[PDB]
Amino acid sequence: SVQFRPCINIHKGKVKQIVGSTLKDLKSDPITNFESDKSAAEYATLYKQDGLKGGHVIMLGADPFSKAASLEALHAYPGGLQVGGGINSDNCLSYIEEGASHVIVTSYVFNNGQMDLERLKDLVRIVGKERLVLDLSCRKKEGKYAIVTDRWQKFSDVSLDAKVMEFLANFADEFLVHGVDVEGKKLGIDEELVALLGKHSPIPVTYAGGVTVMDDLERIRTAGMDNVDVTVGSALDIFGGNLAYKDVVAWHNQQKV
Ligand SMILES: NC(=O)c1ncn([C@@H]2O[C@H](COP(=O)(O)O)[C@@H](O)[C@H]2O)c1N/C=N\CC(=O)[C@H](O)[C@H](O)COP(=O)(O)O
Ligand SMILES: [Cl-]
Ligand SMILES: [Cl-]
Ligand code: NA
Ligand code: NA
């Protein structure tokens, strides 16, 4: 059954929803859909009350106050949330010890545009594959989906396809995949990507990006063959959108039957 995997994005110490492809910190501010002074713990507690497991908190960018904010969410819902944003071999265990169920990684395991297998094996040695989520967010490039790194500001040379997902599944508990081109834009999902994930992921996989109306959740079911879980950010009423969080929760609970 498809699960709603909720999110909390933290940028410069604040809960925000942004258009991720407009983050330009590797070298105009990002387009911001929503920002709040509300503690990330309040969102974590909301998700906990509704029984949503396996959501993710993202520490977007290098500001140290974003780390402090993310720990507020993990402490409010221990075991309930995955955490990502600049995770590496030096800090990955510390996030598990703050209450995260998993750490989410992309950039640390890429160098020279290639998968760095030694770094991947280092993370697996430290936290175990059961507590590692590999994020394979991607953009279509030359007819294939290319995994993008460095907060979606660099194309890797690794394609998201059947053989890559089969191989990387030996090192991760789940995959998280953002449709980078559609994310944050409230224009709908990338059904081609969802279908690829549902057909070829041997482990749980969560798609994120562009879910805007209830019918998009049904498109997730159909394109993904009920094999792909789904995150909603910008469109949710609690993040300034028009799609009611309460209606997405009820839809999630209806999948369990
Ligand atoms: N530029 C970015 O925005 C971004 N770049 C990397 N990540 C993730 O940072 C983590 C660590 O990667 P790394 O070891 O730091 O390289 C990985 O997961 C990267 O893929 C991002 N996700 C940020 N928020 C996610 C979010 O708000 C909702 O999930 C989603 O966008 C809502 O979509 P919606 O509004 O409904 O369209
Ligand atoms: Cl790289
Ligand atoms: Cl909306
Ligand atoms: Na890297
Ligand atoms: Na977003």
Structure tokens at 136: 């394979």
Residues with CB under 5 A from ligand 2 (ion): 110, 113
CATH number of the CATH domain containing 239 = 3.20.20.70
The number of domains in the chain is 1
| Resolution (Å units) | 1.5
Q: Is residue 227 part of a domain?
A: yes
| 3-class secondary-structure state, position 20 | helix
Residue 117 CA: distances (Å) to CA of 27, 79, 111, 123, 170: 26, 28, 10, 10, 12
Instruction: Identify how the structure was determined.
Output: X-ray
Structure tokens at 253: 């609970």
Q: Which ligand minimizes its atom distance to the CA of 153?
A: 1
Q: For ligand 1, is residue 7 a contact (CB within 6 Å)?
A: yes
Residue 74: domain span: 7-255
Q: For ligand 1, is residue 240 a contact (CB within 6 Å)?
A: no
Radius of gyration from C-alpha coordinates of the chain: 17
Q: Give the residue whose CA is nearest to atom 32 of ligand 1.
A: 233
CA of 243 to the centre of ligand 3 (A): 6
Q: Which ligand minimizes its atom distance to the CA of 244?
A: 3
Q: Is residue 2 part of a domain?
A: no
Q: For ligand 1, is residue 230 a contact (CB within 6 Å)?
A: no
How far is the C-alpha of 105 from the C-alpha of 149, rounded, in Å?
Answer: 10
How far is the C-alpha of 124 from the C-alpha of 126, rounded, in Å?
Answer: 5
Burial (CB count within 10 angstroms: exposed 0-12, middle 13-18, buried 19+), residue 163: exposed
Residues with CB under 5 A from ligand 5 (ion): 17, 184, 233-234
Give the chain's end-to-end CA distance (angstroms, integer). Answer: 9
Q: Which ligand minimizes its atom distance to the CA of 111?
A: 2
Q: For ligand 1, is residue 135 a contact (CB within 6 Å)?
A: yes
Q: For ligand 1, is residue 20 a contact (CB within 6 Å)?
A: yes
Contact call for residues 100 and 82 (beta carbons, < 8 A): yes
Listed in sequence order, the residues at least 6 apart from 239 whose beta carbon sits closer than 8 Å to its beta carbon are 17, 33, 34, 233
Q: Is residue 48 part of a domain?
A: yes
Q: Is residue 1 part of a domain?
A: no
Sign of CA dihedral 124, 126, 130, 132: negative
Contact call for residues 203 and 228 (beta carbons, < 8 A): no
For the beta carbon of residue 27, count every other beta carbon within 10 angstroms: 4
Q: Is residue 29 part of a domain?
A: yes
Q: Is residue 193 part of a domain?
A: yes
Contact call for residues 159 and 145 (beta carbons, < 8 A): yes
Q: Is residue 49 part of a domain?
A: yes
Residues with CB under 5 A from ligand 4 (ion): 107, 110
Q: Is residue 21 part of a domain?
A: yes
